Design a protein around this nucleic acid. Structure first.
Ligand SMILES: [Ca+2]
Length: 579
DNA sequence: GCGATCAGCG
DNA sequence: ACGCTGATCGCA
């Protein structure tokens, strides 16, 4: 029902200088995954190519790698990485339909061509799930069915580029696509393919020692419980704590007694068992997620883990990281932080280099709200987290611990993003009217922040969406809901998204500027990870001194705000030491 | 498959 | 009853 040439060899008219291109990778994790089929749509026709022929053809490979042959695609990072695993370079992607749909509306959840095309009333293409099936029934269909699907996807991309670019232009997002998200996609592809080297012997040893410390705490729990039970079982655990031991019930879930860490912490004055449960969970979390889970996904021949950075998932413009998630490696407890000792440079005599924006969302908020006092604070390079800790815990600057600062950090963001007196009182374990009076004091010092919070809720109601500094957008239909709770969640999104999303915009621009700078200085240094406001690199030890001046400067100059941006940085032999 | 939970970023 | 996430595990 759509005409195309099921081609046996590559021809010249397949190599025009503008095309829609589909390089189909069906496995969700595309690292080292099969390419099951190729389709090209251009001015000369529609073509399906078997990958064993196309990717072994030197003219087609050269076309793939020629940046002057422009390709329109959907999820070009997926294709670029799968091709890197075949030793083939993809260049010249000038339009990525996934990223275009994401910028137009992140709430659509667009995960295939059909979903993007639906946004423009184009429906002559099937959802990937209808073609490949679900779960245990998932399969590549027979070649004629496969070929028509890939061709229909390519034809959709060919037809949809212009209407998507027109709407992007109307939203002031066309440079956001072409100068930020698409260049970033190529940089993320390099990062994912490079991977991060893991010291598996250290992990395996830590996992042996965890298993021993687990039994010891486990027996102490059975002994303090007076009996043995499944410590992971909410039935039995709730029964043990709140029926057998008769501890107070401070919170329930839709299914029963809550045993969350905040609850257990408040029960520490009542029974010694609750802090053993905490210790037990923390150890088991390290064991299951960060020892076992990490070893599962190491490629044994190279000792590398290859994350996937999802660039078109979060509602604020952040990245997320999957399989493994390398944006939530432990750091705050000394036991967990030692896992970072297993993250090592991928070459001898290289080192890990880590750089992070200081107080990033507060600096962004100061600029956007134009609060006189907050802008003055950052012009003085004050540490607002430490200052807030001093005031909360009634200590001097010298007395503030890393844990106290961590806590004041949640107070600072809690207040500006709409925490209530109740929530603040429950977090600080203080009176509720003391919490309310601390909140009113906070907005007395920062009245511009309060005005901003009020104004942005009104702008979201009037326009139906909010935006970031580089024109990323989030629609907030619930902001006019008549249901108080639904409306309230939407108001807090109006408060938070422009700030968190602008911080995402800034680090993304920083990454593009950094890669351009590293190429210009001809350095071997390269990015490995982004962790929201942090960039992790590795480089020969002979490049470190140059990087100590280069990376902070690139990050600090990525944008020019009404306050300075400030970067902290460290380097060392492992990720652990790069702090 | 989902909800509670907890690891991270602010 | 601050916001944005992903992985694991038990299932009242
Ligand atoms: Ca930071």
């Amino acid at each position: 029902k759509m005409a195309f040439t099921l081609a046996d060899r590559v021809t010249e008219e397949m190599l025009a200088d503008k095309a829609a291109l589909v390089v189909e990778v069906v496995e969700e994790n595309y690292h080292d995954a099969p390419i099951v089929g190729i389709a090209v749509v251009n001015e000369h026709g529609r073509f399906f190519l078997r990958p064993e022929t196309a990717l072994a053809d030197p003219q087609f490979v050269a076309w793939l790698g020629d940046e002057t042959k422009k390709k329109s695609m959907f999820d070009s990072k997926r294709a670029a990485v799968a091709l890197k695993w075949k030793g083939i370079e993809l260049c010249g992607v000038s339009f990525d339909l996934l990223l275009a749909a994401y910028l137009l509306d992140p709430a659509q959840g667009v995960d295939d061509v059909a979903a993007a095309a639906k946004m423009k009333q184009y429906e002559a293409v099937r959802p990937d799930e209808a073609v490949y099936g679900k779960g245990a029934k998932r399969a590549v269909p027979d070649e004629p069915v496969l070929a028509e699907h890939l061709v229909r996807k390519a034809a959709a991309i060919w037809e949809l580029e212009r209407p998507f670019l027109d709407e992007l232009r109307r939203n002031e997002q066309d440079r956001l696509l072409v100068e930020l998200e698409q260049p970033l996609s190529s940089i993320l592809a390099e990062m994912e393919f490079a991977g991060v080297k893991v010291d598996t012997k250290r992990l395996e040893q830590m996992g042996k020692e965890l298993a021993e410390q687990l039994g010891t705490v486990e027996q102490r729990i059975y002994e303090l419980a007076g009996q043995e039970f499944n410590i992971n079982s909410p039935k039995q655990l709730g029964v043990i704590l709140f029926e057998k031991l008769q501890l107070p019930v401070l919170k329930k879930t839709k299914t029963g007694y809550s045993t969350s860490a905040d609850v257990l912490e408040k029960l520490a004055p009542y029974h010694e068992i609750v802090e053993n449960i905490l210790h037990y969970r923390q150890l088991g979390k390290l064991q299951s997620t960060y020892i076992e889970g990490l070893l599962k996904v190491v490629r044994p021949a190279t000792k590398k883990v290859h994350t996937i950075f999802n660039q078109a998932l979060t509602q604020t413009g952040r990245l997320s990281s999957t399989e493994p998630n390398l944006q939530n490696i432990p750091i705050r407890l000394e036991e967990g932080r030692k896992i970072r000792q297993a993250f090592v440079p991928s070459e001898s005599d290289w080192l890990i280099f880590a750089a992070d924006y200081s107080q990033i969302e507060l600096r962004v908020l100061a600029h956007i709200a134009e609060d006189d006092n907050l802008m003055e604070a950052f012009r003085r390079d004050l540490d607002i987290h430490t200052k807030t800790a001093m005031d909360i815990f009634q200590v001097s600057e010298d007395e503030v611990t890393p844990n106290m600062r961590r806590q004041a950090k949640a107070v600072n963001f809690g207040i500006v993003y709409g925490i209530s007196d109740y929530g603040l009182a429950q977090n600080l374990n203080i009176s509720r009217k003391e919490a309310a009076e601390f909140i009113e004091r906070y907005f007395e010092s920062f009245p511009g922040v309060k005005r901003y919070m009020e104004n942005i809720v009104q702008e979201a109601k009037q326009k139906g969406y909010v935006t970031t500094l580089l024109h990323r957008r989030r629609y907030l239909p619930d902001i006019t809901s008549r249901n108080f709770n639904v409306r309230s969640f939407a108001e807090r999104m109006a408060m938070n998204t422009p700030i968190q999303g602008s911080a995402a915009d800034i680090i993304k621009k920083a990454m593009i500027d950094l890669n351009a700078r590293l190429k210009e200085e001809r350095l071997q240094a390269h990015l490995l990870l982004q962790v929201h406001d942090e960039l992790i690199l590795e480089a020969p030890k002979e490049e470190m001194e140059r990087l100590c001046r280069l990376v902070p400067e690139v990050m600090e100059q990525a944008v020019t705000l009404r306050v300075p941006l400030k970067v902290d940085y460290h380097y060392g032999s492992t990720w652990y030491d790069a702090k």
